[PDB]
Amino acid sequence: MLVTYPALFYYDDTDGTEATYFVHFPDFEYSATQGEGISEALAMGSEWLGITVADLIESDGELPQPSDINSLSLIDNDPFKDDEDFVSTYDLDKSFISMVSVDVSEYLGSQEPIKKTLTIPKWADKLGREMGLNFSQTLTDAIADKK
């Protein structure tokens, strides 16, 4: 399931710096991610896109129609251009516009229920129930806790 959206890659050196490319998709309002170099910025843009679009699909929201890349400007499509409280410092020449693709198949189905057959001692069974635990949730939390 491939989708492609144009993105703006803003070079900023002044951050001191680490990640020099701010990545924004005009079709997703205030969409923001970043990368250190060109390749990383694209890869992060793709990952952000996968997660965002997968969420829209699994929540059955509508996917925005992709903008025509030739109608985009680093100036006019600046997400912060109308924001009175923010100051952009872009180096325009080090900034570029490019397509970003992602296969959304990799981001789909992460919340899918997976049946597990477990064996626990009776003392744990009795204890968990005495505490009114949710065994499914308790195991999930425990796994997320191990990292």
């Binding site: 803003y10 951050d15 680490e18 020099t20 701010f22 969409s31 923001a32 990952e47 912060f80 992460s110």
Partner: protein, 58 residues
């Protein structure tokens, strides 16, 4: 919120709940009636931070 952790903290204090379903290098924040917010790990540049804040109305 110069870092992911500080940013998560900030949104959490404003009613967002960290979630599973962000993958790879990103995490996902969720709140009722809102489009979820996807946050990159590590230090964030002023633009990324600002965009994330704007998404959350902060």
């Amino acid at each position: 919120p110069m870092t992911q952790k500080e940013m998560v903290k900030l949104l959490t204090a404003h009613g967002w709940i960290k979630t599973r379903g962000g993958k790879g290098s990103h995490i996902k924040m969720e709140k009722q009636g809102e489009r979820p917010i996807t946050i990159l790990h590590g230090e964030l540049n002023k633009y990324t931070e600002r965009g994330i804040r704007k998404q959350a109305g902060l």
